[PDB]
Design a protein that fits this description.
CATH class of the largest domain in chain A: Mainly Alpha
Oligomer: part of a larger assembly
Shape of chain A: elongated
Main location (chain B): cytoplasm
Subunit structure (chain B): Homodimer. Homotetramer, dimer of dimers.
Number of strands of chain A: 7
Distance between the termini of chain A: 11 Å
CATH architecture of the largest domain in chain A: Up-down Bundle
Number of helices of chain A: 24
Family (chain B): Belongs to the PAL/histidase family.
Structural class of chain A: mainly alpha
Radius of gyration of chain A: 31 Å
Strand order of the largest sheet of chain A: 3-4-5
Protein name (chain B): Phenylalanine aminomutase (L-beta-phenylalanine forming)
EC number (chain B): 5.4.3.10, 4.3.1.24
Chain lengths: 620, 612, 620
């Protein structure tokens, strides 16, 4: 299962300490992401590929180089490629050299290892590559000590020769082929593509998992994930996503509550869920497969000699080809961007269902707690932003590779545009992170609303029950009124529970007429009138008390039951509420939606979200 | 190799007689394309393997029913408009795919309805279906359902067009009275998106292989360097599509007589490396090969699925509510294939462009114009213009459809695949790709003729120069100089007027005549003999060049691309394009296009690839 | 003419000191751009519209507000809308209020004037608007003193209530409608659209003008701009662009040189220019019209009551409509982005012709000076970047408005996405600036190469002429050899002028054989052999001397003629060479292409480019 593969990626990202660069051991996208984001991760170039590097180097030894670099130092600082992308590119260039096909000196390779481990990188302009001569020229420029090339060292910026000075290096004098060997690669496109693919895997898994949380809060039917449905339409991504969702929803206490819900007023409630949940495995299927396949493609590029000419020293020839052509990466970046847009549309559709009372099976509009809805518009602002996020995301998913210009005196009459496409896919993922942050925040709001819903219904039942006993109502009467208290969605009358025009009192009045018809008439009416009168003394205060207690909440014996404790999604709710310090959104909570969603976004952006994710998936 | 897989696909398309429909034997895109396109291919629905579960399922549904609704669903969905139609090929494919879905025994449909679909398929009866209305395929599948229930508004083709109940009469059927779940089962599938996607994928595989193969023919005519396909280059950047396309190209170009001429060309006096359109072809092809092969597996998975809802698990006495009608696997992969097809078109455009430009074609004339009189021969300029038009529309088509999901059907379908719309656009892209391939192949046959004429003409110039050098009593020094010029100067740069003193032959000869004067410095008689040489050259040279060209109007005989050249020239009855060939470019390219469209191109393709 | 209108925009941008905000005087995109970019520009709210504001305010006076703001403070800091865009939005919101339709208090309007003039603005998240509730909530948040809202003051960041403190204001307590009045506008989309349109006008005019410079350096035929061609196909933008180009090219000394060029070897040279020049007015036509029309549309929005409800106090009603809908701006932002892409394609095509010897009519490949081309690849890096720039630009020009989602509980089932589209058009313009910077830099390189070309041909002629006299060659002989010296493109043999295999000696040898044939034979040959021998003693040194002098260059009597001094494009060449301190690019010039293009880019980005532009167009 891809779920296991992604879990393995997250684990490698967390666990790696040294990246072995040796011409045989594959570098994965997790390794690339770790080097870029975790500064304690070091490069280990192993001399035991030095033999093949030096043979190729020697073979080639059998002004022109600096002129190539000068020509290519032609970008403009408008914006730059981040240091994370630049260090990634440095790693990938070094790796390309390990296969003994480039002819660069071992000493240059050692210098790259040193600069990487000392956190030295050139500042590189964002644009200029059709895929990565111009950006790679800035790395070549640092190595040869060009004064115009500025280098960061940690977070301190100096001219290139001073940067080499601080790590005990002196400017290289380039030998035959070395200039070309340094600039003639796919390092930048593939670097950005590597962290893109790492993020795509993590966020894909997060979205899949959160489909389960959506099911729990929306009162879905977990049947959509039944293995027979998917065995019979066996797209690998469809079988695997459904398999995860089936396990996530097995023995869920929210699914038990969902079953109870649909047994009440069965005829009046939807027989199937809407597509955003029911069709999630079918939808996820291509998206899973695209992201997994693109991960294999990008990693093949990471672990390639992307250079020209290719030296076959064993057979005494230089081979003229085009391993500098970033097309594998570029086409796959276009596909993944379309898949990310598809994940965004899934999230948007789910979020939309959640905000609308007609589609949320009992939840309040905008997930507004109220009770006073005139001064609580709940998550409306987040709902508007989700439309803005999806709209821009769908726009971004148009292809880049369809815009190939005939370039460089018509020499490059096909060119990959891989870096440009990878940059766009990264931008799409930024928006997907925003959409996931909002979706999870809304679902935690929904958890609270469902838990509160149950406690409020219990209060109404207790009030109806005890008042019926007090007023001396018949069994037939008590049975009917308690059914109304159980069946009427509490959020439809929470604003003013005793309002005779709102659904609770409307339901009670229907049942009161029905009990009169079914059955001392004059005394019955008097007792029903006293029931109604006492209901408006007691009910609202008791509903208020239970809600205030919930809002003000370590649980004790007075606190409302919290079904979340029995749910596999506990790690997510607890992470967002306890660890990030948030609470039910309402007019009484000072913090803005920005403040709450910002905390969730930050945790997704910096990888802290993987902790609750890994907790949730334990035992799968 | 994917190469062997595609060859397997072509062979299946050609050789299949009966499509077995049995619930276990996979139906491939070649099978779907063969049913659609070849009318001798019949459906064989096999009771022995699947009727038993079909029957148990439909009985289960009846049991639950016992413990007009269907017609009203069909009526509501007869909601298309004839503006344009889904073609009979797509509709018959849809009927096959719906029938196949039913074999898994999850649908609750009666076996007798399945027999009717087999009967209609084998008698060439299909409803007329509006093009548009599906978000993926209720509306278009309703027309199949409307035929089966004899809706008079549904028009049916037979082979002749009549209303549905009359169409049923002619195959000995009566209108069905739908049982519980049958109305839904008939309309609740991915059959039309997947049908169009199936022929799309068959065509994509064939056209991919054709493009890869023609990259080798391009190398031969453009004077490329075949080392770009060396296995070590691709071993060290091991994308499977890159390794496999290069493997084919190395084999195609090994022992090429054109590559021999190429090597000789770069030995006199010129680019050190080929431009990208050839040198970078394996790298370019890599993701395109991989996208088309992967999308073929996805489409075939859909063909062989129970795309329906609810899914009946009769064995455990329950109906499962899901969304197997969602065509997202197909829709997304149609978006990717369209981008890959645009990538194929861009490769062809780049190659064709190089071929038309004298600066980039290594000796060929601009527009591949034979002339000699270029003022009345613009050669293939019209085709060159069209290729830009083709690529431009193609790049536009490759924008995604799946990014345009609306919240549909009372917001119930808040995600939908749009797979049929996407398949239709990929089909349109492939139409354009066929046009581009036909033009490219036509141009390369022209280029073969021009290369073979070139070799013969250079020999005539050498023969003329040599013999006149003897006749005029020129020194050996002089003779060797003049002969080097006759070999070095690209003949197409002076063919228009060989003795024009401002064109490159005489310019080179005049240079050499001065060098010979300096080197040998009886001077007056030497000058007299050089003047007489120039005089006799303008009496004789053009005449003998004309004679050899008129005779023309060996090298390809040793090329792996012989089958293609012979197909286009001999079998399709064409010739080198010129002012003396009455047939328009349209007439020649139409023949090539027609052979691509109807699959006749696969014969020289398979010949070419024999023993690979 | 649109040329006059754009000149008027640039002049207003430069000249404005106070922006009158009074409900009658139009605010133009130049005023909006000036406020944003020039801090000495102040807002002047005139009390003599205060009467209508207060009447509307009073009419409305006949908790709910802060709850709206709280709900909308829902963006995430991922990136932000720049202070320039935020201050622009503040101006546009203030302007909307002046029409007396909003019901906001005059005091709130005074507060906005004060914050603008004191350089106070909230930090605003980039995304969230479908067009501008969420971003406008940050301005509303500053005004009401929300602690979570951070404000910049100059370049110093503090919480909102402290920001109000420093400008002598206290948090507002919002009255009826004021919350909605503040957030219910198109201010952000229209702000970004205003500076987009200002830049689009300036850069359009710059591109049109530079088509004339391209003609001069490429040896074009100015006939393409003849007024009859355009009178007969009378698209307004076509007539007006051709009219500019005709005037720019009238009495040009480069066009005189071009005429001489095509009189030599007439038969062998193209009879017409390629489309990048010849078709420029036809191409520019729609682009001109789109940018001008979109300027009118955006300015109408700037000068509108974009708010709801609209108060008709005169007739005692509040009118319910949708003036908050940014569709006019959004659709036009899509069109302008397509037009900007079209300008980019024009530049790319021109740049491509310039770099290729087969298309540049005598100029060297990559505009490489050499003479040693093995170590001078000239502008190749810039040529590659231009392909990268165009490719991304064409991708950006896909539409945003085609991605309308049904938003906000399906209430906003159509929405403009105007801010998103405007942001994309701004990004497209960033790339257009990069492409213009490169194009102008290449054309200055080309100016130098043409001036040098003329001086080198003069040297060859002088050497041939005097050596012919020295060696005692016949008139027939001297006449022929001087024709060769005049006709052979010097850049085809500059690498090694006496190389017998290169075009100069090839031409001389052809003519020597021709003179022998046309005409003491043995003495003639001896003199021709001595000519050739002396040519290889003298020629290269004299060509070198003239070139070195040019490179090392206030002109004196030894210096080569500089035709640029007589050209209307002098202001551009002089700006780039003298004012920005650059020179002919070559292996002997230390500065990288980055360094040279960076200077030009900076001048375009900050508006300094308008000075040479206005000089060039003086008298049109």
């Amino acid at each position: 299962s891809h779920v296991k593969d992604i879990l393995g990626l997250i684990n490698a990202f967390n666990e790696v300490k040294k990246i072995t660069v040796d011409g045989t051991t594959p570098i994965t996208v997790a390794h690339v992401a770790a080097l870029a984001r975790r500064h304690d991760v070091k490069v280990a170039l192993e001399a035991e590929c030095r033999a093949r590097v030096e043979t190729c180097s020697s073979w080639v030894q059998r002004e022109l180089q600096e002129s190539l670099i000068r020509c290519l130092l032609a970008g403009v600082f408008t914006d730059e490629l981040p240091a994370t992308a630049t260090r990634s590119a440095m790693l990938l260039r070094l790796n390309s050299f390990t296969y003994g096909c480039s002819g660069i000196r071992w000493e240059v390779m050692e210098a790259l290892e040193k600069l990487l481990n000392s956190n030295v990188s050139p500042k590189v302009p964002l644009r200029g590559s059709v895929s990565d001569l111009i950006p790679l020229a800035y790395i070549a420029g640092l190595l040869i000590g060009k004064p115009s090339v500025i280098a960061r060292i940690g977070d301190v910026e100096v001219p290139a020769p001073e940067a080499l000075s601080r790590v005990g290096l002196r400017p290289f004098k380039l030998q035959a082929k070395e200039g070309l060997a340094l600039v003639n690669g796919t390092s930048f496109a593939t670097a950005v593509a590597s962290t893109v693919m790492y993020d795509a895997n993590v966020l894909l898994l997060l979205v899949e998992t959160l489909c389960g949380m959506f099911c729990e809060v929306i009162f879905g039917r977990e049947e959509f994930a039944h293995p027979l449905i998917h065995k019979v339409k066996p797209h690998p991504g469809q079988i695997e996503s459904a398999e995860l969702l089936e396990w996530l929803l097995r023995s869920s206490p929210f699914q038990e509550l969902s079953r109870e819900y649909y047994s009440i007023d069965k005829l009046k409630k939807p027989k199937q869920d809407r597509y955003a949940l029911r069709s999630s495995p079918q939808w996820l299927a291509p998206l899973v497969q695209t992201i997994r396949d693109a991960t294999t493609t990008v990693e093949t590029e990471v672990n390639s000699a992307n250079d020209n000419p290719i030296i076959d020293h064993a057979n005494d020839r230089a081979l003229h080809g085009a391993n500098f052509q970033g097309s594998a990466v570029g086409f796959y970046m276009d596909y993944v961007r379309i898949a990310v847009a598809g994940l965004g549309k899934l999230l948007f559709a789910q979020f939309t269902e959640l905000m609308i009372e007609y589609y949320s099976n009992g939840l309040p509009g905008n997930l507004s707690l109220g009770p006073d809805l005139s001064v609580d518009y709940g998550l409306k602002g987040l709902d508007i932003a989700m439309a803005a996020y999806s709209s821009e995301l769908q726009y971004l998913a148009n292809p880049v590779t369809t815009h190939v210009h005939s370039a460089e005196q018509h020499n490059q009459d096909i060119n990959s545009l891989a870096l440009i496409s990878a940059r766009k896919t990264e931008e799409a993922l930024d928006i997907l992170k925003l959409m996931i942050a909002s979706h999870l925040t809304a679902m935690c709001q929904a958890v609270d609303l469902r838990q509160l819903e149950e406690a409020l219904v219990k209060v109404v039942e207790n009030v109806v029950s005890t008042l019926a006993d007090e007023c001396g109502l018949p069994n037939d009467t008590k049975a009917r009124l308690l059914y109304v208290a159980k069946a009427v969605p509490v959020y439809t009358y929470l604003e003013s529970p005793c309002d005779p025009t709102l659904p609770l009192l409307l339901g009670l009045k229907q049942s009161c007429f029905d009990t009169i018809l079914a059955l001392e008439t004059d005394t019955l009416v008097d007792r029903l009138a006293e029931f109604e009168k006492r209901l408006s003394d007691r009910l609202e205060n008791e509903m208020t008390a239970v809600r205030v207690l919930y809002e003000k909440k370590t649980a004790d014996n007075n606190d409302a039951l919290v079904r979340i404790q029995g749910s596999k999604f506990l790690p997510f709710y607890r992470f967002v509420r306890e660890e990030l310090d948030t609470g039910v959104m309402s007019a009484r909570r000072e913090q803005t939606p920005q403040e709450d969603v910002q905390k969730v976004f930050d945790a997704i952006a910096d990888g802290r979200i993987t902790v609750p994710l890994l907790h949730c998936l334990q035992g799968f």
